[PDB]
Every structure is written in C-alpha cells, then in structure tokens.
Amino acid sequence: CSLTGKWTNDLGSNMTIGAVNSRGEFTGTYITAVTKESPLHGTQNTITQPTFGFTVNWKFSESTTVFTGQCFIDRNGKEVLKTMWLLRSSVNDIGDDWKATRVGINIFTRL
Amino acid sequence: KCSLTGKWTNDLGSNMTIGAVNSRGEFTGTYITAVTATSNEIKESPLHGTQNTINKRTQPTFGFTVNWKFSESTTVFTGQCFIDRNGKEVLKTMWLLRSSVNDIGDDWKATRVGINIFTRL
Amino acid sequence: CSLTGKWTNDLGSNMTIGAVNSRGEFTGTYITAVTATSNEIKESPLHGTQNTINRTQPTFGFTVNWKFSESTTVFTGQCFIDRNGKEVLKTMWLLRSSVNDIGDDWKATRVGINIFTRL
Amino acid sequence: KCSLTGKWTNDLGSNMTIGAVNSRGEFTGTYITAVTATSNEIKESPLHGTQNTINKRTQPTFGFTVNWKFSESTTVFTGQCFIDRNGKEVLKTMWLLRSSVNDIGDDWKATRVGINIFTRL
Ligand SMILES: *[C@@H]1O[C@H](CO)[C@@H](O[C@@H]2O[C@H](CO)[C@@H](O)[C@H](O)[C@H]2NC(C)=O)[C@H](O)[C@H]1NC(C)=O
Ligand SMILES: CC1(C)CC(NC(=O)CCCCC[C@@H]2SC[C@@H]3NC(=O)N[C@@H]32)CC(C)(C)N1O
Ligand SMILES: CC1(C)CC(NC(=O)CCCCC[C@@H]2SC[C@@H]3NC(=O)N[C@@H]32)CC(C)(C)N1O
Ligand SMILES: CC1(C)CC(NC(=O)CCCCC[C@@H]2SC[C@@H]3NC(=O)N[C@@H]32)CC(C)(C)N1O
Ligand SMILES: CC1(C)CC(NC(=O)CCCCC[C@@H]2SC[C@@H]3NC(=O)N[C@@H]32)CC(C)(C)N1O
Ligand SMILES: *[C@@H]1O[C@H](CO)[C@@H](O)[C@H](O)[C@H]1NC(C)=O
Ligand SMILES: *[C@@H]1O[C@H](CO)[C@@H](O)[C@H](O)[C@H]1NC(C)=O
Ligand SMILES: *[C@@H]1O[C@H](CO)[C@@H](O)[C@H](O)[C@H]1NC(C)=O
Ligand code: NA
Ligand code: NA
Ligand code: NA
Ligand code: NA
Ligand SMILES: [Zn+2]
Ligand SMILES: [Zn+2]
Ligand SMILES: [Zn+2]
Ligand SMILES: [Zn+2]
Numbered sequence: 001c002s003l004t005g006k007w008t009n010d011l012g013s014n015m016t017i018g019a020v021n022s023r024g025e026f027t028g029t030y031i032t033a034v035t036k037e038s039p040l041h042g043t044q045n046t047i048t049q050p051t052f053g054f055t056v057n058w059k060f061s062e063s064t065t066v067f068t069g070q071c072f073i074d075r076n077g078k079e080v081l082k083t084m085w086l087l088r089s090s091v092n093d094i095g096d097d098w099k100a101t102r103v104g105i106n107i108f109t110r111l
Numbered sequence: 112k113c114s115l116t117g118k119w120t121n122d123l124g125s126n127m128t129i130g131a132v133n134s135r136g137e138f139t140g141t142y143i144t145a146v147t148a149t150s151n152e153i154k155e156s157p158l159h160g161t162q163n164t165i166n167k168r169t170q171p172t173f174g175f176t177v178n179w180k181f182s183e184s185t186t187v188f189t190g191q192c193f194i195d196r197n198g199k200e201v202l203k204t205m206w207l208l209r210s211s212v213n214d215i216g217d218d219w220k221a222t223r224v225g226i227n228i229f230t231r232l
Numbered sequence: 233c234s235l236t237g238k239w240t241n242d243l244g245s246n247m248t249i250g251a252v253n254s255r256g257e258f259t260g261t262y263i264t265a266v267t268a269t270s271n272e273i274k275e276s277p278l279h280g281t282q283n284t285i286n287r288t289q290p291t292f293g294f295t296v297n298w299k300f301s302e303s304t305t306v307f308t309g310q311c312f313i314d315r316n317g318k319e320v321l322k323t324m325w326l327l328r329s330s331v332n333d334i335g336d337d338w339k340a341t342r343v344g345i346n347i348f349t350r351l
Numbered sequence: 352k353c354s355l356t357g358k359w360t361n362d363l364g365s366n367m368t369i370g371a372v373n374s375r376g377e378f379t380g381t382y383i384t385a386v387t388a389t390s391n392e393i394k395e396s397p398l399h400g401t402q403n404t405i406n407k408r409t410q411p412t413f414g415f416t417v418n419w420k421f422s423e424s425t426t427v428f429t430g431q432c433f434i435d436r437n438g439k440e441v442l443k444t445m446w447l448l449r450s451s452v453n454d455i456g457d458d459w460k461a462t463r464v465g466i467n468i469f470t471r472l
Contacts, residue, residue: 011459023178034459034460043157044178045178045185051185055173055175057135057161057163058163062163063163063172064174065174066174068176068208068222070221082218084344085207086174086189087460090172095386097191098363098465101205102460103343220342220344222342222344223342224343224464225341225466226465226466256418257399279377279400280416281397283451285422289453293447295400295401295416299405302406306428308425309449309462320455324447325447326447328429333433334434334443337431340443343464
C-alpha cells in the first residue's frame with residue numbers, strides 16, 4: 001500500500017502522487033472535479049497500511065485544502081485511501097474566521 | 112503582511128518553527144508539541160506545507176503536514192495568517208489527527224479534530 | 233424527504249426517528265453497529281430538530297445520548313433525493329469523548345460522516 | 352457538580368440559556384448568536400440537547416442542536432462541562448454547521464466546523 005500512482009475519489013477528482021522518499025516525503029498533482037489542477041505536498045509516516053497527510057496548494061483560488069488518512073487493503077485486495085479533509089477559505093477580517101473551515105471525507109481507489 | 116517564516120507557539124504550549132517560503136509557497140519546518148498520547152517520548156518532528164500565493168494576500172491561507180517521528184499517527188493543519196487589530200500576527204488553524212488502525216472497519220474512529228492559535232515566540 | 237422512519241448507515245447502524253412535530257422537534261432510537269468500548273452495545277435515545285425555514289430537502293441535527301458509554305455523538309446533515317427518487321441522509325458527526333482534566337480536551341473530539349437509507 | 356443549566360456566553364460573544372436537565376439528561380434552551388453571515392436579522396433560536404448520565408460524572412459530556420429561526424441552516428454542538436483549577440465552570444465544545452444546498456452534488460461543501468468556549472454569564 002503505497003500512495004504513488006494515479007488515484008480517483010468519490011467526487012470524481014483525480015490525484016497523482018510521485019515517489020515517496022526515505023523520509024516519507026512525496027509530491028503530486030491534484031485534479032479537482034468540483035470547485036482544475038494544482039500541486040500537492042505531504043508526507044507519509046515511516047515507522048504496510050501507513051497514515052499520511054498532504055496539502056493541496058490551489059492555483060485558481062485563495063483557499064487551501066489538507067487531506068489526511070490511511071492506506072488500507074480491502075477484503076478483495078484492492079488499495080483504498082480513506083481520508084478526511086479541511087478546506088480553509090480566505091476571509092478578510094479575523095472576526096470572520098469562525099466560518100472559514102469546511103470539513104469532509106474522500107475515498108480514493110487506484111485509477 | 113503576515114508570513115509564516117518564523118518561530119510560533121500555540122495555546123497548548125507547542126512550538127513551531129517555519130523556514131523560508133519560496134516563490135510557490137512551499138515551506139518546511141519543525142514541530143515540538145507540548146502534548147501527546149503515545150507511550151513513546153516526544154520528539155521534534157518535521158513539517159511540510161505550502162502557503163497560498165493567489166493574489167499575494169497579506170493574510171494568506173496555508174496548510175502543512177506534521178510527520179511525527181515518535182508516533183504512528185499524522186496531523187494536518189490549515190488556517191490563515193491573520194494580523195490582529197493591535198497589529199500582531201496570529202495564526203488561526205484547525206487540525207485533523209489521523210490515527211493508525213489495522214482494521215479498515217476501525218477507520219470511523221481514527222480521525223480527531225481540533226483547533227490551534229499561534230503567535231510569534 | 234421526512235426523517236420519520238427507520239434508517240441504516242454505511243457502518244450498519246440503525247436508527248428509528250419518530251414523528252417530527254410542528255417546530256421540527258423529533259425523538260428516536262439509535263442502534264450503533266460499531267463501538268470500541270468494552271461495554272455491550274445498547275440501544276440509546278436520540279433528540280434532534282429539523283429546520284422549518286421554508287423545504288423539500290431540509291437540514292437537521294440530533295444528539296445521541298449513549299446509554300452504554302460516557303461519550304456523546306451529534307449528527308447533522310440534509311435529506312436528499314437521488315436520480316432514482318431514493319431518499320438519502322448525508323450527515324457528518326462529532327464524537328465527544330469524556331476526558332479527565334480540561335487539559336486533555338484537545339484529544340476528546342472525533343469527526344466522521346454517515347450516509348443513511350431507509351431500512 | 353458541573354451542570355449546563357444557566358446562562359452561558361462564548362468566545363464569539365454569543366449567549367445561550369439552558370433550562371432544566373431532567374433524569375434522562377434531556378434539556379432545552381435558547382441560543383442568541385452574536386455572529387452570522389446572512390443579512391436576515393438575527394433572531395433568537397431554540398435548542399434541544401441531552402446530557403450524558405452514565406456514572407453521573409461530575410464533568411459530563413453533552414450535545415445539542417440549534418434550530419435556527421432566521422436561516423435554513425442547522426448547527427450541532429458537542430462538548431464537556433469542566434471545572435478548572437480556579438473552580439469556574441467551562442464548556443469546551445466543537446460544532447458542525449450544516450448548510451442547505453439544493454442538489455446532492457453540492458453536499459461536499461455544506462458542513463463547516465469550529466469550536467466555542469462557554470463561561471457562565
Ligand atoms: C439493523 O436492522 C437490520 C434489519 O432490521 C438487522 O439485520 C438483521 O441482522 C441480524 C444479525 O445478524 C440477522 O440475523 C438478520 O438476518 C438481519 N435481518 C435482516 C432483515 O437483514 C441488523 O442486524 C440491524 N443492525 C443492528 C446493528 O442491530
Ligand atoms: C466553498 C467554496 C467553493 C470553496 C472554495 N473552492 C475552490 O476554491 C475550488 C478548489 C477546491 C475544491 C476541491 C475540494 S477539496 C475537498 C474536496 N475533495 C475533492 O476532491 N474536491 C473537493 C472556493 C470558495 C471559498 C469561493 N467557496 O466557498
Ligand atoms: C496515541 C494516538 C493514536 C496518537 C496520538 N499522537 C501523538 O501522541 C503524537 C504527538 C503529536 C500530536 C499533538 C496534536 S497535534 C494537534 C494538536 N496541536 C498540538 O500542538 N498538539 C496536538 C494522538 C491520539 C490522541 C489520536 N492518540 O492517542
Ligand atoms: C474512544 C472511543 C473508542 C470512541 C468513542 N466510543 C463510543 O462512544 C462507544 C460507541 C458509541 C459511538 C457510536 C459512533 S457514533 C458515529 C459513528 N456512526 C455510527 O453509527 N457509530 C459510530 C468514545 C469512547 C471514549 C467511549 N471510546 O472509547
Ligand atoms: C450564509 C450561510 C448560507 C448560512 C449561515 N447561517 C446563519 O447565518 C445562521 C446563524 C449562524 C449560526 C452561528 C454559528 S454557529 C457556531 C458558531 N458558534 C456561535 O456562537 N456562532 C457561530 C452559515 C454560513 C455563513 C456558513 N452560510 O454560508
Ligand atoms: C480522471 O481520470 C480519468 C481517467 O484518465 C478520466 O476519464 C477523467 O475524466 C478524469 N477526471 C478529471 C476530473 O480529471
Ligand atoms: C517553547 O519554547 C519556549 C521558549 O523557547 C519554552 O519555554 C517552552 O518550554 C517550549 N515548549 C515546548 C513544548 O517545547
Ligand atoms: C450577551 O449578553 C451580554 C450581557 O449583557 C450582552 O451585552 C450581549 O449583547 C449579549 N449578546 C448578544 C448577541 O446580544
Ligand atoms: Na468582514
Ligand atoms: Na477492530
Ligand atoms: Na491530564
Ligand atoms: Na449544483
Ligand atoms: Zn509545489
Ligand atoms: Zn521531511
Ligand atoms: Zn431522551
Ligand atoms: Zn424546539
């Protein structure tokens with residue numbers, strides 16, 4: 001169960017994760033189906049079914065999304081990425097901060 | 112302007128140091144949490160994240176991952192670099208703390224959520 | 233898309249939502265299919281309200297008062313209709329664990345989703 | 352010893368009043384939000400929740416829904432009643448704000464999250 005490869009989630013978004021170095025660091029591109037491509041950066045815990053997390057630095061909005069989850073192996077043997085994300089929006093005054101963070105899930109399978 | 116480069120501390124007492132943010136918003140840093148839950152020892156862990164460059168906002172959004180060096184878990188933060196009314200820089204963040212579970216059926220319980228406020232140290 | 237009825241979620245949990253009165257208030261029971269405690273699962277009550285402002289697909293929220301654990305879970309979502317006319321309860325929940333000292337609060341809340349269909 | 356009955360105020364400046372908590376831990380009350388993002392005039396809204404009764408812990412957990420009367424949204428709070436070193440009662444809570452979207456395809460963006468700290472008013 002390694003994050004490298006092409007992934008697709010329930011919303012139809014695509015994700016491509018490059019190589020994961022010894023420290024667990026990886027890069028990739030994120031193709032969002034709902035709102036376009038944007039780079040992503042994250043690391044995977046090193047110490048089989050590891051936990052991971054990455055940031056998606058969007059290039060068509062001021063927002064930032066972070067994903068985190070675990071690489072599982074289904075009963076049938078397929079790799080499944082079960083993750084949750086926080087989508088931070090850009091507010092002007094810090095008084096509007098209470099409404100800036102959304103939350104949700106995404107399930108990825110090998111594209 | 113509010114830049115993440117610097118040394119920060121949050122309401123739990125954890126300390127965070129963020130290096131330089133390059134022309135694309137990518138940065139790296141270390142995280143020294145004040146709290147834990149594992150049987151192992153607390154250790155300065157690396158963090159990798161990015162800062163939004165769209166419009167070069169003076170209060171941009173950001174998000175980074177903390178790859179813990181003593182726990183099997185992973186934590187992701189995201190928030191906004193804010194400038195107070197007095198003029199002090201403050202980070203308003205929310206984090207997800209993914210736990211490691213061997214059963215994919217145990218996945219429903221492997222994600223904690225919380226907040227964190229950061230100021231310069 | 234009324235909440236009244238019996239529902240089942242992706243985790244295999246069942247919940248029966250009684251009648252929703254004029255103000256949107258409703259009561260019911262929740263039979264969770266999963267737990268990590270050592271205690272035996274036990275049907276627990278739920279109390280929640282439904283938004284009446286204006287709808288075909290209203291937003292709602294309800295608390296589950298667990299009777300076998302010291303914790304508390306709250307759900308909130310929207311009643312949707314599919315392309316095949318099927319009712320779906322898309323929800324997210326916050327699971328509050330009981331901690332000893334307020335200092336241990338940071339690690340007390342879990343988060344997740346649950347999709348419901350009529351049983 | 353830490354009961355939710357009484358009038359509370361949060362870090363945002365909002366106020367709520369929690370009536371009586373019965374044997375089963377059920378309770379109702381009122382919530383007057385201090386902030387909002389709709390131009391509709393903020394209108395006092397009812398709330399329904401329940402307190403955990405297992406073991407009658409001095410610091411129980413709780414949750415309640417707030418049925419907004421001036422918006423199509425719903426917010427759920429869950430937390431714990433604490434007694435700090437000083438002796439004051441505090442409510443540590445996290446909330447989900449479910450927005451009303453038209454189609455089920457917009458559902459992914461209909462739930463916000465945050466915290467609130469309440470102290471007796
Ligand atoms: C939710 O309800 C369904 C149906 O009412 C339950 O399904 C039954 O589960 C038992 C347990 O193994 C089986 O022996 C029955 O054959 C099932 N019946 C049907 C019609 O499927 C289900 O167990 C309930 N879930 C929980 C957690 O109680
Ligand atoms: C709510 C919304 C639309 C959020 C902001 N969206 C964007 O900027 C588009 C880029 C992010 C969308 C991808 C998310 S990310 C998690 C989820 N998982 C997945 O695969 N796609 C989705 C824009 C503003 C703030 C204006 N509004 O508010
Ligand atoms: C044991 C297990 C599964 C793992 C725990 N991981 C740790 O102990 C590593 C220490 C770093 C975490 C610090 C968090 S990170 C966000 C917040 N902000 C801050 O500064 N500290 C806290 C976690 C849990 C409780 C899930 N359990 O217990
Ligand atoms: C830490 C842990 C394992 C988690 C919590 N476990 C419980 O609360 C007991 C089981 C009842 C909760 C059912 C949830 S609710 C959302 C999800 N959706 C669904 O259908 N079931 C699940 C708290 C404590 C600390 C007791 N334990 O220990
Ligand atoms: C504008 C719209 C569609 C509706 C908004 N609904 C409202 O205006 C109704 C009242 C808001 C409740 C106040 C929250 S509740 C948790 C927190 N604790 C507290 O005391 N206040 C805040 C919501 C948003 C802006 C998301 N969307 O966009
Ligand atoms: C994802 O990849 C598949 C296969 O290449 C393609 O059919 C689909 O259109 C892609 N979706 C997006 C949003 O790029
Ligand atoms: C953070 O730094 C300050 C000053 O350098 C120090 O007093 C404090 O103990 C540090 N906290 C942690 C958790 O390392
Ligand atoms: C909450 O109560 C205080 C106490 O007087 C009051 O000043 C404040 O206006 C109240 N909040 C709102 C939103 O009315
Ligand atoms: Na504003
Ligand atoms: Na298990
Ligand atoms: Na403690
Ligand atoms: Na739409
Ligand atoms: Zn990059
Ligand atoms: Zn690294
Ligand atoms: Zn009850
Ligand atoms: Zn009511």
